[PDB]
């Protein structure tokens, strides 16, 4: 809908306004900025994933790369199962911990949920 860009925008050397999609070699970082009512102005900068991975060793990165693709396969399974059966949303009924444990779980900063015998994640007794 960039009909014909306002002549006023020409002053702005550093900006260029694309009116059709450009496939590039890739992008490194981006700036999503926005404004609002009541002098609310907020800007965020994002940087491509690669640069994070460049903190590790081929050791670590390639060990993570394997975990990732295992997930993508559970995720894939789920999505298709869900699209068909109408369960992309599963409402949780009971919380993880039985009621009697609650105070303890809330206070033990290391208490964590274990896999259980039906496939349900619970805090253990």
């Amino acid at each position: 809908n960039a009909d014909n860009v306002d002549k006023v925008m020409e002053q702005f050397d550093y900006i260029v306004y694309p009116s059709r999609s450009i496939k590039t070699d890739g992008i490194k970082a981006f700036s999503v900025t926005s404004f609002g009512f009541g002098q609310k102005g907020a800007q965020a900068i994002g940087v491509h994933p690669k640069y994070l991975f460049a903190t590790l060793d081929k050791a670590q990165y390639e060990a993570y790369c394997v975990k990732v693709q295992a997930r993508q396969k559970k995720a894939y399974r789920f999505f298709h199962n869900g699209l068909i059966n109408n369960k992309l949303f599963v409402a949780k009924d009971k919380a993880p911990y039985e009621d009697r444990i609650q105070s303890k779980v809330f206070l033990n900063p290391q208490s964590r949920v274990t896999q259980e015998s039906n496939g349900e994640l619970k805090f253990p007794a």
């Binding site: 009909d3 014909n4 009116s19 059709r20």
Partner: protein, 48 residues
């Protein structure tokens, strides 16, 4: 060329709006200008 043209269309839709701006994005030399307008040469009034 540096030409300013005024083009008349009898099917004035976004689809045709687009087509012409598409054209101008590619052929618009500095100095040039494209003005599209709805028109119907069947009409005496339209003409005048």
């Amino acid at each position: 060329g540096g030409a300013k043209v005024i083009v008349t269309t009898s099917r004035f839709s976004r689809q045709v709006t687009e087509y012409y701006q598409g054209i101008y994005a590619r052929c618009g030399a500095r100095g040039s200008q494209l003005v599209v307008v709805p028109f119907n040469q069947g009409s005496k009034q339209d003409v005048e």
